[PDB]
Design a binder for these strands. Structure first.
Length: 276
RNA sequence: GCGAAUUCGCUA
RNA sequence: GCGAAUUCGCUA
């Protein structure tokens, strides 16, 4: 077997988005606030490259590619696991056929010290929300239980539509003053519970849970720099998507945390820069 | 983003 | 095929 090189893709939010530019009124998420990040595993050294910006939703992020380890070996089993996850990142999370517009892999702390997050990779592979919508069995006697902690750093998908390609959302807010019995913003339905019952024939087992504000996960491919009728229509679609209020019981939590998802969307730009 | 309708520009 | 304008449907 040939020896490996491991690089960390360092990310720091060096210029937070100014208020005048925060049109979608998002929270800002510095990548450096969470330890799990991405790295690159290669058989060749990567030539030294200067720091460069990607322009994300939260502002300008400085990217630095730094050597974490070299000269070590990995077993075939681990290389295959890493390979599957690289493919997973581009085919299932970003849904992209051309990663650069050798293997990206997750790194995490073992104690302020970055290494390949094998456990995280294994958890992904075991997740029932790994690809699509996981089965659930909420009944009156075994109802849905809302745990706030599970929604703090979550990406969620609706369990009740778009089965072939689910819409993924960041949880942007937890509305504790709302429940499924809150008033529905349309004269056609009295409550959120009635909407989901009438539209989808969905029953709820928990009428006390808070509701959720969401932010679509969609990102443009090239973030290396900071109009039309069609772009207008798309912008209007994204606005309505972001006005949606969802019911936790009716959604599934994706195994990839929001904090890591926010970093993943930078990957195509970074690989493009490295290759071109 | 996935669709529809109507109208206009680019070829000889 | 490469573009543009106007209008409508799908999410809560």
């Amino acid at each position: 077997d040939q020896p490996c090189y491991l690089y960390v893709i360092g990310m720091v939010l060096t210029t937070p988005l100014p208020d005048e530019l925060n049109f979608r009124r998002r929270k800002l998420y510095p990548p450096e606030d969470t330890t799990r990040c991405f790295g690159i595993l290669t058989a060749k050294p990567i030539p030294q490259i200067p720091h460069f910006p990607v322009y994300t939703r939260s502002g300008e992020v400085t990217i630095s590619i730094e050597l974490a380890a070299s000269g070590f070996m990995l077993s075939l089993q681990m290389l295959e696991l890493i390979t599957r996850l690289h493919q997973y990142i581009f085919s299932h999370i970003l849904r992209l056929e051309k990663p650069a517009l050798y293997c990206v892999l997750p790194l995490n702390v073992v104690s302020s010290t970055l290494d390949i997050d094998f456990k995280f990779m294994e958890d992904i592979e075991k997740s029932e929300a790994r690809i699509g919508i996981p089965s659930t069995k909420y009944t009156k006697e075994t109802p849905f239980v809302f745990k706030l902690e599970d929604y703090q750093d979550a990406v969620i998908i609706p369990r009740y539509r778009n089965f072939d390609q689910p819409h993924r959302f960041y949880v942007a807010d937890v509305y504790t003053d709302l429940t499924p019995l809150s008033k529905f913003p349309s004269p056609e339905y009295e409550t959120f519970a009635e909407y989901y019952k009438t539209k989808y024939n969905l029953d709820l087992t928990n009428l006390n849970q808070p509701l959720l504000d969401v932010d679509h996960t969609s990102s443009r491919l090239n973030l290396l720099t900071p109009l039309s009728s069609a772009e207008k229509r798309k912008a209007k679609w994204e606005s309505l998507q972001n006005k949606q209020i969802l019911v936790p019981e009716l959604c599934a939590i994706h195994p990839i945390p929001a904090s890591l998802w926010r970093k993943a969307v930078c990957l195509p730009s970074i690989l493009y820069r490295l290759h071109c």
